């Protein structure tokens, strides 16, 4: 189940699924937690490695066996995802990092009085994922008190530099501290355009909204329903953003459903798991394991315990059943979502609850 233990002076080797820059090991672990395939991570603080462009390196990893070889390396930090850790799963990261410049796409500069006022500007700008603030002591005078609001692919810095008198941090939007509004609207028969940042398959628009909420680049979405006119585009969840952070257009379109990320929401933030069981539906994906169980609910329990299981299909086809048990197909994909969603089947599909952090 839940493994919070960290491993000092350790670097996991191989199994790499994604890498990025993060300011510390706790942030790297959080990105591991929310990456659909990450089980293990290794982090390199600036002190731990000579190579410049490997400092602050955060390496997300997977293993069919849940274990990997590791080497001793002084100062490196390794650990697990917080999958299956309930309330410890959080997107909230409050830390101000002093003497650090988290680099990205600068879309906003102003002069501010303190780092916490810079943090506030970032938190209340919908496009800001992280910021950098140069203090009154900063060596170059023109930049003193500059507050830079930034974003980047995946919401992690494209570089992190050790730099005196610069203070960086992330938006507190995922800490429910934004004054940006929470928009629960679901628009029937309505599509957005702008810029597509990801594409997955979802059984309904509500799953699509939840994925958008926790995807670092998604501000709004358009879901194409199972009765959408183009067969190959059925159940397509289009995650989107725009230059301003707001949709620049909207198009009435039958069998399309659109809405917003809910990450600004407080009382009504959806948790990062999808609990609904979907009768009559097959979820395509890589087979992880086939077990015989009594009823869809135990099949979901079985997926949830199998930490690498992302979603499941419990079949009632006669060829998949025997004396008082039917087969539970445990599955996974590259992105956490089904590779195909097929209707009119004798099977009930659902998701792992490994990331539920409520209830």
């Amino acid at each position: 189940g839940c493994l919070t233990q960290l491993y000092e002076n350790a670097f996991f080797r191989g199994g790499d699924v994604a890498s990025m820059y993060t300011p510390n090991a706790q942030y790297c672990q959080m990105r591991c937690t929310f990456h659909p395939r990450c089980l293990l991570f290794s982090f390199l603080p600036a002190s731990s490695i000579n190579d410049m462009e490997k400092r602050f390196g955060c390496f997300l990893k997977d293993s069919v066996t849940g274990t990997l070889p590791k080497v001793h390396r002084t100062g490196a930090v390794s650990g697990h995802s917080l999958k299956q850790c309930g309330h410890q799963i959080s997107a909230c990261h409050r830390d101000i990092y002093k003497g650090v410049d988290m680099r990205g796409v600068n879309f906003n500069v102003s002069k501010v009085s303190s780092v916490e006022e810079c943090q506030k500007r970032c938190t209340n700008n919908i496009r800001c994922q992280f910021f950098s603030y140069a203090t009154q002591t900063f060596h170059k005078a023109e930049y003193r008190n500059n507050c830079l609001l930034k974003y980047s692919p995946g919401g992690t810095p494209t570089a992190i530099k050790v730099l005196s008198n610069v203070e960086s941090g992330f938006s507190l939007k995922p800490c429910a501290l934004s004054e940006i509004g929470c928009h629960m609207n679901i628009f029937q028969h309505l599509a957005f355009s702008d810029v597509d940042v990801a594409r997955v398959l979802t059984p309904d628009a509500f799953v699509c909204r939840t994925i958008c909420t926790y995807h670092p680049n998604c501000l709004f979405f358009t879901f194409y329903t199972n009765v959408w006119k183009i067969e190959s585009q059925r159940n397509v969840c289009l995650l989107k953003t725009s230059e301003s952070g707001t949709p620049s257009s909207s198009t009435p379109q039958e069998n399309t459903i659109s809405g917003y990320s809910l990450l600004t929401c407080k009382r009504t933030l959806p948790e990062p798991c999808h609990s609904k069981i979907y009768p009559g539906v097959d979820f395509g994906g890589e087979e992880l394991n086939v077990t015989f169980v009594k009823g869809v609910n135990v099949c979901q329990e079985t997926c949830t315990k199998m930490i690498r299981c992302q979603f499941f299909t419990y079949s009632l086809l006669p060829e998949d059943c025997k004396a008082e048990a039917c087969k539970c197909f445990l599955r996974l994909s590259m992105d956490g979502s089904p590779t195909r969603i097929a209707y009119g089947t004798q099977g009930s599909s659902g998701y792992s609850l490994r990331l539920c952090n409520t209830g």
Binding site: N106, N108, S132, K140, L148
Partner: peptide, 7 residues
């Protein structure tokens, strides 16, 4: 456009 902090 908006340059980074120097050095």
């Amino acid at each position: 456009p908006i340059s980074d902090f120097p050095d």
